[PDB]
């Protein structure tokens, strides 16, 4: 049961903005994707455990923080209309690579 | 990387739906498929490992071919409601999936 607190987020270009995740049911490592009609799921960082953070396929332009299992936040200091998709958080923790996606958070970077 | 040829599809509440996938990294083992329902999050749905060459779970079936790294999931009696985006994922890392780009399908009924 993964939770994406705010479903609709908006921001002005060049403005810090964070995306938080929470997961009832301890599933050690979490993730951080961005839905973009053209290329699916596409991951940007993710952590193995509480204090870890590892780059993904789309790192740079973002920053990730795993303050402590359960919650996992993805930070965007200095927004950009380039990062105006849907951010999906997901957890998991066994072989088979079964990932559990949250409901999603739509981000619109106003600017231009 | 992963590729899905299908991309955007429509079928008659009937026929078989075939969505194709492909990958290159020979490091890859085990490939699950996820299906996203319009306006909702992705969820798993019928996965396979190169060990075998087929897997069934209802009308959902995956056909896998070793080199010439092609994979393809078949939906039988493609019914409306099966319309989703259908993502093809591949891997080999113990949870962590490298995702394809998906192929949105919609089954017109009646």
What do you see in this structure?
The complex is a heterodimer of chains A (112) and B (110). In chain A, strands 1-3-6-5 form a four-stranded antiparallel β-sheet, with no helix packed on it. In chain A, strands 2-10-7-4 form a four-stranded mixed β-sheet, with no helix packed on it. Chain A is an all-beta fold. In chain A, a hairpin with a 2-residue loop joins β5 and β6. Chain A has no helices and ten strands. Chain A has a single domain, classed as Immunoglobulin-like (Sandwich), CATH 2.60.40.10. In chain A, 0% of the residues lie in helices and 36% in strands. Chain B has no helices and eleven strands. Chain B is mostly beta strands. Chain B has one domain: Immunoglobulin-like (Sandwich). Chains A and B meet through loops of A and β5 and β10 of B.
Highlighted features:
heterodimer, A: 112 residues, mainly beta, Immunoglobulin-like, four-stranded antiparallel β-sheet, 10 strands, B: 110 residues, five-stranded antiparallel β-sheet, 40% strand
